[PDB]
Design an enzyme around this catalytic site. Structure first.
Site, PDB file in Angstrom:
ATOM      1  N   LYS A 114       0.579  -3.090  -1.639  1.00  0.00           N
ATOM      2  CA  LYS A 114      -0.428  -4.106  -1.921  1.00  0.00           C
ATOM      3  C   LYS A 114      -0.280  -5.307  -0.995  1.00  0.00           C
ATOM      4  O   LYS A 114      -1.274  -5.818  -0.467  1.00  0.00           O
ATOM      5  CB  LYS A 114      -0.335  -4.537  -3.386  1.00  0.00           C
ATOM      6  CG  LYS A 114      -1.033  -5.852  -3.708  1.00  0.00           C
ATOM      7  CD  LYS A 114      -0.945  -6.188  -5.186  1.00  0.00           C
ATOM      8  CE  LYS A 114      -1.669  -5.162  -6.040  1.00  0.00           C
ATOM      9  NZ  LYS A 114      -2.255  -5.771  -7.266  1.00  0.00           N
ATOM     10  N   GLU A 171       1.235 -17.573 -10.438  1.00  0.00           N
ATOM     11  CA  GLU A 171       2.125 -17.010  -9.435  1.00  0.00           C
ATOM     12  C   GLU A 171       3.576 -17.187  -9.862  1.00  0.00           C
ATOM     13  O   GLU A 171       3.984 -18.274 -10.281  1.00  0.00           O
ATOM     14  CB  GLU A 171       1.883 -17.685  -8.084  1.00  0.00           C
ATOM     15  CG  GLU A 171       2.781 -17.201  -6.952  1.00  0.00           C
ATOM     16  CD  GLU A 171       2.226 -15.983  -6.243  1.00  0.00           C
ATOM     17  OE1 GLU A 171       1.009 -15.955  -5.972  1.00  0.00           O
ATOM     18  OE2 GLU A 171       3.008 -15.053  -5.955  1.00  0.00           O
ATOM     19  N   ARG A 172       4.352 -16.115  -9.759  1.00  0.00           N
ATOM     20  CA  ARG A 172       5.792 -16.224  -9.933  1.00  0.00           C
ATOM     21  C   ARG A 172       6.383 -16.946  -8.729  1.00  0.00           C
ATOM     22  O   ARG A 172       6.080 -16.606  -7.582  1.00  0.00           O
ATOM     23  CB  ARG A 172       6.418 -14.840 -10.091  1.00  0.00           C
ATOM     24  CG  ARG A 172       5.680 -13.929 -11.062  1.00  0.00           C
ATOM     25  CD  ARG A 172       6.412 -12.613 -11.252  1.00  0.00           C
ATOM     26  NE  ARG A 172       5.827 -11.804 -12.314  1.00  0.00           N
ATOM     27  CZ  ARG A 172       4.788 -10.995 -12.160  1.00  0.00           C
ATOM     28  NH1 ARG A 172       4.178 -10.863 -10.994  1.00  0.00           N
ATOM     29  NH2 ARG A 172       4.347 -10.301 -13.205  1.00  0.00           N
TER      30      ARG A 172
HETATM   31  N1  ADP Z   1       1.301   0.903   6.460  1.00  0.00           N
HETATM   32  C1  ADP Z   1       2.635   0.777   6.262  1.00  0.00           C
HETATM   33  N2  ADP Z   1       3.520   1.077   7.236  1.00  0.00           N
HETATM   34  C2  ADP Z   1       4.849   0.958   7.056  1.00  0.00           C
HETATM   35  N3  ADP Z   1       5.398   0.534   5.902  1.00  0.00           N
HETATM   36  C3  ADP Z   1       4.629   0.197   4.840  1.00  0.00           C
HETATM   37  C4  ADP Z   1       3.171   0.304   4.966  1.00  0.00           C
HETATM   38  N4  ADP Z   1       2.652  -0.083   3.789  1.00  0.00           N
HETATM   39  C5  ADP Z   1       3.685  -0.410   2.972  1.00  0.00           C
HETATM   40  N5  ADP Z   1       4.863  -0.242   3.601  1.00  0.00           N
HETATM   41  C6  ADP Z   1       6.192  -0.511   2.999  1.00  0.00           C
HETATM   42  O1  ADP Z   1       6.097  -0.436   1.575  1.00  0.00           O
HETATM   43  C7  ADP Z   1       6.571  -1.628   0.945  1.00  0.00           C
HETATM   44  C8  ADP Z   1       5.513  -2.141  -0.025  1.00  0.00           C
HETATM   45  O2  ADP Z   1       5.887  -3.422  -0.529  1.00  0.00           O
HETATM   46  P1  ADP Z   1       4.794  -4.601  -0.599  1.00  0.00           P
HETATM   47  O3  ADP Z   1       4.144  -4.654   0.760  1.00  0.00           O
HETATM   48  O4  ADP Z   1       5.449  -5.825  -1.192  1.00  0.00           O
HETATM   49  O5  ADP Z   1       3.700  -4.055  -1.646  1.00  0.00           O
HETATM   50  P2  ADP Z   1       4.052  -3.910  -3.208  1.00  0.00           P
HETATM   51  O6  ADP Z   1       3.954  -5.323  -3.731  1.00  0.00           O
HETATM   52  O7  ADP Z   1       2.990  -2.973  -3.732  1.00  0.00           O
HETATM   53  O8  ADP Z   1       5.452  -3.348  -3.212  1.00  0.00           O
HETATM   54  C9  ADP Z   1       6.880  -2.637   2.041  1.00  0.00           C
HETATM   55  O9  ADP Z   1       8.236  -3.085   1.949  1.00  0.00           O
HETATM   56  C10 ADP Z   1       6.632  -1.922   3.356  1.00  0.00           C
HETATM   57  O10 ADP Z   1       7.815  -1.892   4.161  1.00  0.00           O
END
Ligand code: ADP
Ligand code: ATP
Ligand code: ADP
Ligand code: MG
Ligand code: MG
Lengths: 48, 517, 464, 468, 49
Positions: free
Chosen positions: C159, C185-186
């Site tokens: 997300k 927001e946290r």
């Molecule tokens: N398109 C992408 N390419 C590489 N890594 C990704 C991609 N999308 C998500 N990730 C990995 O998945 C994790 C998702 O965490 P985050 O971005 O905080 O979303 P959420 O809050 O749903 O966990 C991230 O740490 C990131 O490294």
């Protein structure tokens, strides 16, 4: 083959029943919240 | 060998240095009183949330301020209040003493000892309502806080500065999980390094006194009283004490946190605190909402739980980890207070009665339990070994319907079913027995590398335990390597595999079979 | 002409003003807590006129330490937030104060956060599509320009990466800006988002406004309006396309309910505020396209008890134009973005809007994916070989289609050196039309992972 | 220096006093009803200081016939009840009057019924088993000597029958003193208990305090405090083990809720008073064993409408060392005692206290019953024949186990005509170990219904045409 | 209550009485109406305490 068809039908019917029961349960949950608030607010108004 | 010299000297110092020079005081009068609430006229300059003194050394807190009078929550001995009594203002909002002397002590929400062990030497004082660390005063939660429970440490890991809710029905094992975490902090305490030491604060709200005594005995048996403070607001305490106990514990933990220490605080449990606050609000005639709670109960819990933070390096790098407990009714996580606390925290451990009765102890529902910090709160070894646990368990729960049709299932499905059964057996853990991170890593390695595939399910637990014993007696270098490097090296992994195979040669299934190969 | 505090009941404060100096409703008043430990300046928002020169206000900060009779100063205007390009790259609260640099922006132009939506005649009568450049969104769940997009997804589903990607695409493709509104927001998560955006270098294109969890309900109620006001300035004065992120809108609704309870109002059904629909409409109607510019919003929505008929989600969905569901199942497969093509939906996937060819291709993709989902159980338990030959053909085609919905995102470049791709809508439509026909079924599956249009597909096919 | 009645509304009475003569909170005041038919002396407990020298009080007796402006006298102290060895073998009401011998106990020492609980430093966890002879209780919900035990259940599930059974099993051969508190329960039940204790010769060691459901709310609020005051005197002064029986403790909470709204308190959730948890906590924390002074308390907790999520039982749950939860479903299945083996709990049911064998057998029984509960719906719809063979075996074992948890009780004869039975703990553990292993799978399930030990099982199986 | 008093007169004179209340729910509703009209604060289902 008939057993497979009948079990598919039974699973579909169970899914439909689950959906209907969940809808009814959510309606009941909302109604319970509303009625509890109604009683609490009625008491508060009476003591107003 | 009690010499009268010390008693005489103490009393002489008290009397000789006793001065009560008159000071101008603002005084009101109790105009009415009922069930823990006193309405007091006068005190024009009183502050909101100020502490008031009533005759007989009774204490109140000013909550409702209007033109006619002040509403005050009485913190105890309410039966002593009477119309016409003189009320003095202390000029201070609620505050509690804080210092290292609170370790190993049981105190009430005002910081007064209730364990009968004498006075507590306070380093300083902290107001209960000091603001939480600001958004720019923090850093990302990265240090693991090992609870010693494999299910939590592998599925919903907790980092230092995280707020992890422990939510479930009564008698599902929540207090057990929190006490296990506190006990697990003992090795870190013995390390003596403040960067590893974790100071524990156990806040008991609404529990019967004997239950708090049992918890204290459990902590002492494991040597956790050395680094643990208990803030107790038993069921017999006034609603004000139950309302304030979490804030007192948070203030003590905050004093430790802002000095570079790491703190773990358990709130057992916030539902009782919310009930006490609701009672106070209703008795003050504040408007009720859903479930008759006031319009700031979410604010209550959120302001309490946002003080648990991982401080930035500029502020010493200290942290406070929150483990609030919530008791659900009939597993209704949709109730008002559970919904609020779930929205507030960074992750949830849902404990269920059906799992508990099935023998899955701790009864954590891995399907719905989550940790938003996630792998950031795990060491590298745990991250590697525990990577496949979630998907494996989800597939096992999907396939459980086909338990008796294993022959019909293709090879992959049967293998997944057996692996999931063994993993579920692996995540089971006895009470009061936390595991070190290295032992957890080795056990999860057994589970996820197929080394339990040849072991009967009913023996898995025993196998694991014995194996963990064997290594600890003959191949501790594996544990030492895991602990020092926080990763499982290839040489260590192969040595562990050979040790596992030899032990399997030595191990006996309960049904007389052989677990080799 | 200054008032004085008369009653204090938690965050509710009654203030008495001279006869002819009563503040207007929603005016911002200032009071002082001088107690050393809790010293601060309270901002009260005039909520009601009680009569006899009394007003009832909601304190934006905790009232602990406030004394009866202290002077209350009327500012003469409602809560006003700074506006302009200077707010980009900085973190603010619901009151306009900069959190990462106190005092910053105090001299900017300040706009009241309570504003009416565009005049009925100035509204665009024809819906438009917001070409994001992402294959899955553009094909299956096109986003409405000036519309509202619900976002669903647990933790560890991408997300945050999706939000960063949308920030990148609005800043680069549309030359726009982004306003993030963290409602409830946290603080940990707010700090994490701040640092993440700074690292990704998109902070310069984003204005963050945080109403934190540990603040009284008033600020959590008004933070959304604050962020919306910043976005409105960007749309109307700077003539820029704006992307507004709200997280979580349900927390805005719940803060409104808490405020209504605090003011003594009688709760409506399920305990929500009587004016739930009115508040939601006031917030949402300000997010529209007008005069050629638009504010598009992507809002995280929480559904109590997973009950979509609950008044909060029911009122929220009366304004949502699209839904994007992020699924851990898709994420585990490595498909990025992890959008569930079957759970997600859009209200403009209609031939009258996107065209007949687009709708036909999208429906074909959805049908193939649905049949694949149906056959998933048989694959998992009975084994793939148990299926017929046509079932195997459709499984292969659906696997290729579902892997092709993955894309190399701009936000993903910070993780993998490869940059992002922007697939024009026509290219996406024709590529998925070809794929549904089975004209690429012979290619390896990996050739469809994290690529753009057909040229990237061919390039990666030659690489294998 | 006397007050006067100002307002009367049900059991709540407002009384105005002169300056500086306002009675302290909880003080007992006296008023006169002079109407011939209802002539009496009302005892009113001061509940609130309303201001302007007015006090709101709860009448301990019905206020019918009370007149505005009648003189109200302040005794200067709370309600006090007689204490000492003399209360044993006598029946009292909430006010300390001796029902079976009016005027008795007037010269005894009198203790106020309002009292602070023991200091926390004086509290000591209790982890000693109290064997009862009831299979289900001894196996799955072991009681604690000196601990707090409760019997939860809805109306008419067997709470009172089980209370009488535990009086028969525990109090009959008890060295110390017994105190029974009838709190808002049936007068007929009180008379029956009185006669039964007299016939069993246990009355001489028992103090009975009755406030019945026909009494006004104040009496139902204060009778528990009176009985607890007698028990506290026995614990702290005489220094002997005390058995305390309360039936039904929920009536205290119910009377509190009845008067709450008339006291001017805004109602909390589910129509309960806002102070439910605090009042219950005070009362329950007074009911406890201190270091070296043992009170074994057994309480019947009514669960309104069988709803275990109701705030009253939910708040009460936190105050118990052991809880035996009676289920309407089990009752309707004809299983007695109608104990829910999956919902009940005990703090001493761990291997350290009860031993590895007892704990393992109990956990296996709970696991089997949980699996059977899971499979009940499938059996109802698709029938047992569609279960796996292992699940069929488990279902048969679970039905036999659930039938065997039932038992013919000594106090149940009046309802069945069958004399009761007692099973030693070792026999119970052995029998359920055998059952969980399927050693009795060949016997019909009816052979396991309402019996004692394994000898009874063998005899009944033989009577039914099978050999154990 | 009238029926109960009539029966009680016989009961205290050594007679055996049988009293049927058909039905108590209607009496509860009537009492609730009386209490609400007197503006006594309501409880569950608006019944008096
Ligand atoms: N398109 C992408 N390419 C590489 N890594 C990704 C991609 N999308 C998500 N990730 C990995 O998945 C994790 C998702 O965490 P985050 O971005 O905080 O979303 P959420 O809050 O749903 O966990 C991230 O740490 C990131 O490294
Ligand atoms: N891992 C475990 N293995 C076995 N028994 C356990 C385990 N954890 C807890 N228990 C037992 O489960 C019962 C409930 O435990 P605990 O009191 O910690 O739960 P709880 O949810 O906090 O309860 P309560 O509602 O009383 O506060 C106790 O008997 C405890 O000994
Ligand atoms: N062990 C038992 N055997 C047979 N019948 C029983 C047993 N226990 C209770 N009952 C029946 O259930 C009824 C309710 O019991 P009792 O405890 O008096 O009510 P409550 O459960 O409401 O206190 C009894 O009158 C009796 O007829
Ligand atoms: Mg607990
Ligand atoms: Mg009964």
């Amino acid at each position: 083959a008939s057993r497979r068809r009948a079990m598919k039908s039974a699973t579909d019917n169970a899914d439909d029943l689950i959906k209907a029961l969940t809808l009814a349960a959510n309606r009941e949950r909302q109604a319970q919240i509303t009625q509890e608030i109604s009683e609490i607010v009625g008491g508060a108004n009476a003591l107003a | 060998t009690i010499s009268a010299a010390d008693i005489e000297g103490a009393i002489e110092d008290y009397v000789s240095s006793f001065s009560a020079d008159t000071e101008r005081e603002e005084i009101g009068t109790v105009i009415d009183a009922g069930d823990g609430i006193a309405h007091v006229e006068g005190l024009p300059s009183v502050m909101t949330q100020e502490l008031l003194e009533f005759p007989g050394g009774v204490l109140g807190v000013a909550l409702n301020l209007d033109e006619h009078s002040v509403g005050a929550v009485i913190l105890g001995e309410f039966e002593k209040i009477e119309e016409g009594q003189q009320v003095k203002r202390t000029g201070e909002v609620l505050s509690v003493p804080v210092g290292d002397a609170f370790l190993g002590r049981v105190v009430n929400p005002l910081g007064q000892p209730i364990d009968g062990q004498g006075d507590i030497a306070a380093e300083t004082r902290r107001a209960l309502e000091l603001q939480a660390p600001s958004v720019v005063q923090r850093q990302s939660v990265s240090e693991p806080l090992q609870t010693g429970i494999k299910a939590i440490d592998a599925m919903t890991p907790i980092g230092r500065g995280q707020r992890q809710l422990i939510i479930g029905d009564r008698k599902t094992g929540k207090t057990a999980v929190c006490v296990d975490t506190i006990l697990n902090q003992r090795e870190a305490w013995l390390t003596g390094d403040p960067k590893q030491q974790v100071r524990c604060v156990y806040v008991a709200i609404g529990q019967k006194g004997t239950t708090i005594a049992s918890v204290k005995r459990a902590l002492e048996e494991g040597g956790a009283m050395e680094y643990t403070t208990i803030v107790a607001a038993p069921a017999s305490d006034a609603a004000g004490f139950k309302w304030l106990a979490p804030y007192t514990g948070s203030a003590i933990g905050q004093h430790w946190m802002y000095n570079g220490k790491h703190v773990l605080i358990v709130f057992d449990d916030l539902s009782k605190q919310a009930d006490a606050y609701r009672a106070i609000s209703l008795l003050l005639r504040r408007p009720p909402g859903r479930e008759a709670f006031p319009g700031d109960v979410f604010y209550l819990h959120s302001r309490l739980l946002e003080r648990c933070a991982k401080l930035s390096d500029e502020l010493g790098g200290g942290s406070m980890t929150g483990l609030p407990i919530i008791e659900t009714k009939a597993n209704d996580i949709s109730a008002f207070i559970p919904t609020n606390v779930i929205s507030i925290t960074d992750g949830q451990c849902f404990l269920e009665s059906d799992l508990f009765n099935q023998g899955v102890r701790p009864a954590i529902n891995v399907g719905v339990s989550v940790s938003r910090v996630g792998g950031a709160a795990q060491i590298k070894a745990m991250k590697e070994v525990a990577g496949s646990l979630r998907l494996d368990l989800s597939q096992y729960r999907e396939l459980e319907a086909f338990a008796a049709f294993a022959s019909d299932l293709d090879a992959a499905s049967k293998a997944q079913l057996d692996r999931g059964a063994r993993l579920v057996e692996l995540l089971k853990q006895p009470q009061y027995s936390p595991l070190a991170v290295e032992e957890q890593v080795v056990a999860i390695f057994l589970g996820t590398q197929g080394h339990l595939d040849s072991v009967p399910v009913e023996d898995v637990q025993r196998f694991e335990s014995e194996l963990l014993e064997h290594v600890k007696a003959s191949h501790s270098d594996i544990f030492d390597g895991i602990r020092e490097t926080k990763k499982l090296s290839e040489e260590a992994e192969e040595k562990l595999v050979s040790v596992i195979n030899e032990f399997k040669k030595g191990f006996q299934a309960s049904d007389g079979s052989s677990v080799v190969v | 002409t200054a008032g004085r505090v008369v009653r204090i009941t938690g965050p509710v404060v009654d203030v008495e003003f001279p006869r002819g100096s009563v503040p207007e409703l929603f005016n911002a008043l200032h009071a002082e807590i001088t107690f050393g430990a809790l010293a601060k300046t309270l901002t009260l928002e005039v909520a009601q006129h009680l009569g006899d020169s009394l007003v009832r206000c909601i304190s934006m900060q905790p009232t602990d330490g406030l004394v009866r009779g202290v002077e209350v100063t009327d500012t003469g205007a409602s809560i006003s937030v700074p506006v302009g390009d200077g707010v980009k790259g900085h973190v603010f609260n619901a009151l306009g104060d900069c959190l990462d640099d106190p005092g910053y922006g105090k001299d900017f132009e300040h706009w009241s956060i309570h504003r009416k939506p565009p005049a009925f005649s100035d509204l665009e009568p024809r819906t438009e599509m917001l070409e994001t450049g992402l294959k899955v969104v553009d094909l299956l769940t096109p986003y409405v320009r000036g519309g509202k997009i619900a976002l669903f997804g647990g933790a560890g589903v991408g997300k945050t990466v999706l939000i960063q990607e949308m920030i990148n695409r609005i800043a680069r493709n549309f030359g726009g800006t982004s306003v993030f509104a963290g409602v409830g927001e946290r603080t940990r998560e707010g700090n994490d988002l701040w640092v993440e955006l700074a690292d990704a270098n998109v902070l310069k294109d984003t204005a963050l406004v945080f109403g934190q969890m540990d603040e009284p309900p008033g600020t959590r109620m008004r933070v959304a309006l604050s962020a919306l006001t910043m976005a409105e300035f960007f749309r109307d004065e700077q003539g820029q396309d704006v992307l507004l992120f709200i997280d979580n809108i349900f927390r805005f609704t719940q803060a409104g309910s808490e405020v209504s309870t605090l003011l003594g109002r009688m709760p409506s059904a399920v305990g929500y505020q009587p004016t739930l629909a009115d508040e939601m409409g006031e917030l949402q109607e300000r997010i529209t396209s007008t005069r050629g510019r638009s504010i598009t919003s992507m809002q995280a929505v929480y559904v109590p008890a997973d009950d979509y008929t609950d008044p909060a989600p029911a009122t929220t969905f009366a304004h949502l134009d699209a839904t994007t569901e992020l699924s851990r199942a898709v994420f585990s497969k490595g498909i990025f973005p992890a959008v569930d093509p079957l759970a997600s939906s859009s209200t403009i996937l209609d031939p009258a809007i996107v065209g007949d060819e687009h709708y036909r291709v999208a429906q074909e993709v959805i049908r193939i994916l649905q049949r694949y989902k149906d056959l998933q159980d048989i694959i998992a338990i009975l084994g793939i070989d148990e299926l017929s030959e046509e079932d195997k053909q459709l499984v292969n085609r659906a696997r290729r289609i579902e892997r092709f919905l993955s894309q190399n995102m701009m936000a993903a470049e910070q993780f993998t050196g490869q940059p992002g791709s922007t697939v024009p809508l026509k290219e996406t439509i024709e590529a998925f039309d070809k794929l549904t026909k089975g004209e690429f079924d012979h290619l390896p599956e990996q050739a469809f992972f994290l690529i753009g249009g057909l040229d990237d597909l061919a390039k990666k096919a030659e690489s294998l």
